[PDB]
Design an enzyme around this catalytic site. Sequence first.
Site: not given
Ligand SMILES: Cc1nn(-c2ccnc(Nc3ccc4c(c3)c(C)c(C)n4C)n2)cc1CN1CC(O)C1
Length: 269
Positions: A15, A39, A129
């Site tokens: 995303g 990120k 948040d």
């Molecule tokens: C700071 C951050 N860490 N992070 C993260 C950390 C560890 N694992 C994940 N896994 C993950 C897996 C599938 C995902 C996402 C994240 C996202 C943001 C999407 C759209 N998918 C399908 N994300 C995602 C973010 C962004 N944030 C999630 C909030 O929705 C915005």
Amino acid sequence: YLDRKLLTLEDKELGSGNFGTVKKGYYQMKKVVKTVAVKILKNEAPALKDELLAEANVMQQLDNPYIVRMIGICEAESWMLVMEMAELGPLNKYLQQNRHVKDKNIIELVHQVSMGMKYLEESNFVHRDLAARNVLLVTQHYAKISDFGLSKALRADENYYKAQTHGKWPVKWYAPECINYYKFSSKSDVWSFGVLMWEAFSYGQKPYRGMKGSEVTAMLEKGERMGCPAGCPREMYDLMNLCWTYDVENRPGFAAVELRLRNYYYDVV
Ligand SMILES: Cc1nn(-c2ccnc(Nc3ccc4c(c3)c(C)c(C)n4C)n2)cc1CN1CC(O)C1
């Protein structure tokens, strides 16, 4: 700092946020390779870098099963925050696409979030948040809190942080004292947790649908609260209302919230 030569990023992305990308990657560790989410800061071309580093600074101090673990920071083509991958992604989007998920399962997940926030409260950090979008699923039965970009370590002599002017977007998750006095505490996280629960039991619908922030604020000042989501367990709606206690002093801490969830999860199970 992590070694960029040990990190591989997937070209397709997960995303785009404010302002950057999140990509899946693989980080080569002392012998196994670990699946990571990264990120990545968009910076066509200073202080956006500072923000990412602050976010890293918080995560580095947190150690708990229900919080996303940071692997580290990588300085390369872009600045990057590398985290252990929670594969299933954001809770709100997962529930939108998995309506078959049962009330008992939702209860388990929001309970895990309360456990991580009890830890955060005990560590004297405010999240600021806490919303369904910032809960990530490792599996359908294991949630972790993510997104510490707005989070603050509280002073030793105070139980709140004082911010300045907020825009419109975060209002729906904010407690009245946040809106009116810019005061953020573990109790304001508890308010946001009530909204997070309403989200989860609405399968990831938006709170206060079709209302402007100013209207939400007015509704709350009149003693009104969101209604019970279709199908939502009555006791979970009752807990949402306790989290939306107007007066900061009388609103529960996460210790109390976690106990009510544990007890109801047991009752249902
Ligand atoms: C700071 C951050 N860490 N992070 C993260 C950390 C560890 N694992 C994940 N896994 C993950 C897996 C599938 C995902 C996402 C994240 C996202 C943001 C999407 C759209 N998918 C399908 N994300 C995602 C973010 C962004 N944030 C999630 C909030 O929705 C915005």
